[PDB]
């Protein structure tokens, strides 16, 4: 059933045995039984084999052991019984084996240890007791063992350690007690453990720093974390000089002694986080083997200048969330690699601060108040790969010896507007720059976060030559025909009717829109091929604000004056005394256009979204601050006069419309309003586009029709008027008569 190794070794795995195997050679040396179904051990089960050395009973459910069953095994060395179903430590059947070496009792639900247990074992060296349900340390059975080396009691339910627990263990080397529920430690609990090297107390509920550790003279590695320790008194580590590793994290530490960490001749790393009230740098005299130093969350304001004159082998350095104001020189250091200084009050950089660090790779100085950086700062600094400096008021950024850089982030430095030289950064992989136009110099595989897409072009503002000539065309004739029509309507020395003065104001508003378009065309013509250079200055200056205000103002006056024109016509027909009434209404509407245009100016960043200074296209996120409001006002008005004119259609018949000159005026107004409706639908649709997730159009296209479909009325309204109202011809003859009389 079980194979024979030939060297006196017998192995049994999952062969369904409920009793001890028999018939094997009496000279076998090692016996393993695992995964079978033995539940009880009969008396004199192992009397057959007198030369057994190592004994494995793994995984089966043994529950009862006869006291005399284990007798006769005087040479047994290793005994393993884990994951079985014993409930108490077998004080009997164990006293016989004098020459036992290692004993493993894991995963067995054990609650009580008999007093006379572990008696007669004179040379036991390893004893494993974890994952059980122990509730108090077996002081007497432990004292019974004088030659124990390694002790593990983990995951048990111990609550407190009484005094003089481990007096008689002279040669104990390592002690593991983690995940227990210890909360109090006596001052003399650990006496006698002179040769203890490793001490583990993790995840316990310690509420105050223990003192008994000062009795240990040769404690190498010490680990406690996730506890509730909050205060580190000075002189704590005085007793034990040699400490390679100190584990502490997740503790809610508040105060740490000035001289606590002093005179540790062999400590390797030091980490302190969350210690808020500590405000003065620790005294590190005598510690000359510190690879890594980390202090976070404190109130430190200054740094000693002998720091790495002492620390000759420091490799990394991080100091963030402090109140550091000035930086002492780091010239002495040679092995320093990574430096992090964030959320501090640094405001200037000097040449000498970073001089002499040969092997510095990663440098971070983010979220500070630095505004002055010397040109020669970074000049003789060695090969540096990743440099991050952002969210600081910075005016000019030098570049000397940065050719080896790979990662460079500068975002939030709105004061920085100078372009970036492409030749210097030869091996740059990832950029972050505050304004998208700067990346146009690289024209990128370089990665620049800012989108620098169509809405923010590099070479031409208007893009296509056809679009350029088209806007040039409507600009011109809008201007010329608007001037002609206003001269015809106003220069005549005749009484001015309400409708005539109304169309005059229409002409004035359309003229304003036209020279807004003209100023845009002038900018495009001037900045041909090099828009990237001028973009930042143009958007930041007041010109963009002026242009946007002009456009917005021109577009509201036209709409409101048209609405007032068609109710003027409606009630004029109806009374067929409101002339002065409507004149000041027109004035009041002009004032409203003025204030509506100037309202966004007091806000921040509303007019700088696009180089065109028109907010209605918006962008990635215009987040409808007032765009939705404006389109709502425009649509509601249009539907109002749509209803008004439908009512007029119902009231007055078509034959009277054909035979009435006032109705010819009505037809002209109807043409005007219909044109205004269809030419304003597209911009409203574009503003509604981001609200719907399904619809998406390329910035190429939305820019083109936003450019084309905005100013058309300023062009066709005067053309419509002169082409289809002989009223203009009559005024033309009148002004010809006046000119002939003058000349």
């Amino acid at each position, epitope marked *: 059933p079980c194979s024979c190794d030939g060297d006196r070794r017998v192995d049994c795995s999952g062969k369904g045995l409920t009793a001890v195997p028999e018939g094997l050679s009496a000279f076998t040396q090692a016996l393993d039984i695992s995964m079978n179904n033995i539940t009880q051990l009969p008396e004199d089960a192992f009397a057959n084999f007198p030369f057994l050395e190592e004994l494995q009973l793994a995984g089966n459910d043994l529950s009862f052991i006869h006291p005399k069953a284990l007798s006769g095994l005087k040479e047994l060395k290793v005994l393993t019984l884990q994951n079985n179903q014993l409930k108490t430590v077998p004080s009997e059947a164990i006293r016989g084996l004098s020459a036992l070496q290692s004993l493993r009792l894991d995963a067995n639900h054990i609650t009580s240890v008999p007093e006379d247990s572990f008696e007669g074992l004179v040379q036991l060296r*390893h004893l494993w007791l974890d994952d059980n349900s122990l509730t108090e340390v077996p002081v007497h059975p432990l004292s019974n063992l004088p030659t124990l080396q*390694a002790l593990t009691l983990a995951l048990n339910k111990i609550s407190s350690i009484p005094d003089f627990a481990f007096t008689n263990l002279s040669s104990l080397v390592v002690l*593991h007690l*983690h995940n227990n529920k210890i909360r109090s430690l006596s001052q003399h609990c650990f006496d006698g453990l002179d040769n203890l090297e490793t001490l583990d107390l993790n995840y316990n509920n310690l509420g105050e720093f223990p003192q008994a550790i000062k009795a240990l003279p040769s404690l190498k590695e010490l680990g406690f974390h996730s506890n509730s320790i909050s205060v580190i008194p000075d002189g704590a580590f005085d007793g034990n000089p040699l400490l390679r590793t100190i584990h502490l994290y997740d503790n809610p530490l508040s105060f740490v002694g000035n001289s606590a960490f002093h005179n540790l001749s062999d400590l390797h790393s030091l980490v302190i986080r969350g210690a808020s009230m500590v405000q003065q740098f620790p005294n590190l005299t005598g510690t000359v083997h510190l690879e890594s130093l980390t202090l976070t969350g404190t109130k430190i304001s200054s740094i000693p200048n002998n720091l790495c004159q002492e620390q000759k082998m420091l490799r990394t350095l991080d100091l963030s969330y402090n109140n550091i104001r000035d930086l002492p020189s780091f010239n002495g250091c040679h092995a320093l690699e990574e430096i992090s200084l964030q959320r501090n009050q640094i405001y200037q950089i000097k040449e000498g601060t970073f001089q002499g660090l040969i092997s510095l790779r990663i440098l971070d100085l983010s979220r500070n108040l630095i505004h002055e950086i010397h040109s020669r700062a970074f000049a003789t600094l060695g090969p540096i790969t990743n440099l991050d400096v952002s969210f600081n008021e910075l005016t000019s950024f030098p570049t000397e010896g940065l050719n080896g850089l790979n990662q460079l982030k500068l975002v939030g430095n709105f004061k920085l507007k100078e372009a970036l030289a492409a030749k210097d950064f030869v091996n740059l992989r990832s950029l972050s720059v505050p304004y998208a136009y700067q990346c146009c110099a690289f024209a990128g595989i370089i990665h620049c976060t800012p989108s620098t897409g169509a809405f923010k072009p590099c070479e031409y503002l208007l893009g296509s030559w056809m679009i350029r000539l088209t806007v040039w065309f409507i600009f011109l004739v809008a201007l010329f025909f608007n001037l002609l029509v206003i001269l015809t309507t106003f220069a005549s020395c005749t009484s001015l009717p309400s409708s005539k003065l109304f169309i005059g104001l229409i002409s004035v508003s359309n003229l304003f829109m036209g020279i807004y378009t003209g100023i845009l065309t002038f900018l495009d013509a001037v900045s041909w091929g090099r828009f990237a250079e001028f973009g930042i200055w143009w958007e930041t200056g007041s010109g963009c604000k002026v242009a946007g205000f002009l456009a917005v103002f021109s577009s509201e006056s036209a709409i409101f004056l048209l609405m007032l024109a068609t109710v003027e016509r409606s009630l004029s027909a109806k009374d067929i005394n409101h002339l002065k009434q409507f004149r000041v209404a027109a004035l009041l509407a002009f004032l409203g256009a003025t204030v509506a245009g100037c309202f966004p100016l007091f806000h921040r960043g509303e007019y700088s979204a696009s180089p065109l200074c028109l907010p209605f296209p918006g962008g990635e996120t215009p987040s409808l601050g007032f765009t939705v409001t404006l389109v709502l006002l425009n649509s509601l008005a249009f539907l109002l006069m749509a209803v008004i004119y439908t009512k007029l259609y119902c009231n007055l018949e078509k034959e009277d419309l054909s035979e009435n000159s006032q109705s010819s005026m009505i037809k002209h107004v109807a043409w005007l309003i219909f044109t205004n409706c269809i030419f304003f639908c597209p911009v409203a649709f574009f503003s509604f586009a981001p609200l719907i997730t399904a619809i998406s159009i390329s910035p190429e296209i939305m820019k083109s029709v936003t450019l084309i479909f905005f100013p058309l009325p300023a062009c066709l309204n005067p053309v419509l008027y002169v082409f289809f109202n002989p009223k203009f011809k009559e005024d033309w003859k009148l002004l010809k008569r006046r000119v002939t009389k003058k000349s």
Partner: nanobody
Amino acid sequence: VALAESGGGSVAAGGAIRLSCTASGYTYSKYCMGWFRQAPGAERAGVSGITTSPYYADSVAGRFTISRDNIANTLYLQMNSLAPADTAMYYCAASRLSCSAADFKDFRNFVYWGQGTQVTSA
């Protein structure tokens, strides 16, 4: 004390592989073990580890299983659907103190190291 590993070799992409490590001794803490990956020209990195919620690396998430059997004191790591970037040398590391997940991205804490194996994926 002594650590030994078995497994490894050359496998076409998308295969499955099992790596088994055995340990002998008593000083090590059975609640801190890890598998470490090394590619030439770079320092060791921690692929996976057992802590007391196993710690898994960013990259190998969803394709790597780590298990421990204290019945026979063996550590198992099974991989499936490998990518060629997984071709490297593998180590088993055991500590002397209990450890958390935060201790696994720094190898210097671990002390007991194995001889290692080599696995290549095509």
